[PDB]
Amino acid sequence: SLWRQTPDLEQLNASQKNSIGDLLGIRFEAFDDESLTASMPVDSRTHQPFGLLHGGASVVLAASLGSMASYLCVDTSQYYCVGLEVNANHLRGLRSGRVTAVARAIHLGRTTHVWDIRLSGDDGKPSCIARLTMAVVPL
Amino acid sequence: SLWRQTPDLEQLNASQKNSIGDLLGIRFEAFDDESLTASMPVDSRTHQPFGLLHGGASVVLAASLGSMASYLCVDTSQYYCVGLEVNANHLRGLRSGRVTAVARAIHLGRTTHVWDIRLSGDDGKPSCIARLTMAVVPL
């Protein structure tokens, strides 16, 4: 019921062709009535120079997730979504494995959306939190 | 005088090998007594699905720039830098060309650094602004 357009994981993944998403290994994984989930590897592709997960790389995952989520909540025959503001806190560093991100809606207004995005590594300990604000703009 | 270690553009660029930086085309361009500048193409590598500049991609550039800047302001025999908090506002969309980012220091404390990062396209109109907070942590 959150979703206007019921999420299509294959199409979500397919639509990332020729994008920064596909380039970093982002993969949409699951969704339910209230959330959307994507993951990304912690490797060379996403590494900052030190073999650590680039804060940016975590932020790309969060931004891709939340903007896609927003896109599935609007009437896309009449509206599109643009990023307005984004913030994030680094909670724990990540070395190897994959980072998983889960988006939940905080507020879906007529003109803005606010998404809460929680990230964690394979041990499932929170590694990053982000809040994303999108603008809903008439097509 | 801002810099402890005087910036080495070649080495800065070289150190990005096998990183998300090199993957997106980030290139350190210039520096002066008070600032560091890097650029990135607005293309397929950095595109969100719609042929637009992924907000993440702007944020990677800002994060790479500011963390590198922070790294050049600490005694690296004793300290390293970790991202704590980052935020950004989308100001104008970007279609083609390159986005240029300039980092300036807001505050360099003993335990935290705050960097102001201004981004703009080739028309030189501001496209994004970011503020980055790094932690300085004993090695």
Nearest C-alpha neighbor of B86 from the set B49, B112, B54: B112
Of B23, B67, B82, the CB nearest to A45: B23
Structural resolution in Å: 2.3
The answer to whether the Cβ–Cβ distance between B20 and A85 falls below 8 Å is no
Contact indicator for B78, B138 with CB cutoff of 8 Å: yes
Task: Kindly list the residues from chain A whose CB atom is less than 8 angstroms away from the CB atom of residue B26.
Answer: none
Hey, is the C-beta of A20 within 8 angstroms of any chain B C-beta? yes
Place of tokens 């070395």: A95
Beta strands per DSSP E along A9-97: 27-31, 35-41, 47-48, 52-53, 79-90
With residue B126 as reference, give the H or E element that holds it: strand B126-138
Place of tokens 């109109």: B125
| Pairwise CA distance, residues A86 & A83, whole Å | 8
Task: Kindly list the residues from chain A whose CB atom is less than 8 angstroms away from the CB atom of residue B16.
Answer: 49
| Pairwise CA distance, residues A20 & B133, whole Å | 25
Experimental method: X-ray
Interface-testing mutation among A8, A28, A48, with chain B (most B C-beta atoms within 10 A): A48
Q: What is the DSSP letter of A124?
A: -
**B residues 70-129 closer than 8 Å to A (CB):** 82-90, 93
* Nearest Cα residue in chain A from B15: A49
| CA atoms B4, B116, B67, B43: torsion sign | negative
Both tokens assigned to B81: 């830098």
Place of tokens 């931004």: A63
CB count, 10 Å around CB of B79? Answer: 17
Number of folded domains in chain A? 1
Nearest C-alpha neighbor of B72 from the set B99, B38, B100, B98: B38
| Pairwise CA distance, residues A108 & A136, whole Å | 10
How many pairs of residues across A and B have Cβ atoms under 8 Å apart? 111
> What range defines the domain where residue B39 resides?
1-139
Contact indicator for B22, B61 with CB cutoff of 8 Å: no
The answer to whether the Cβ–Cβ distance between B47 and A20 falls below 8 Å is yes
CATH of the domain at B14: 3.10.129.10
| Pairwise CA distance, residues B131 & A87, whole Å | 10
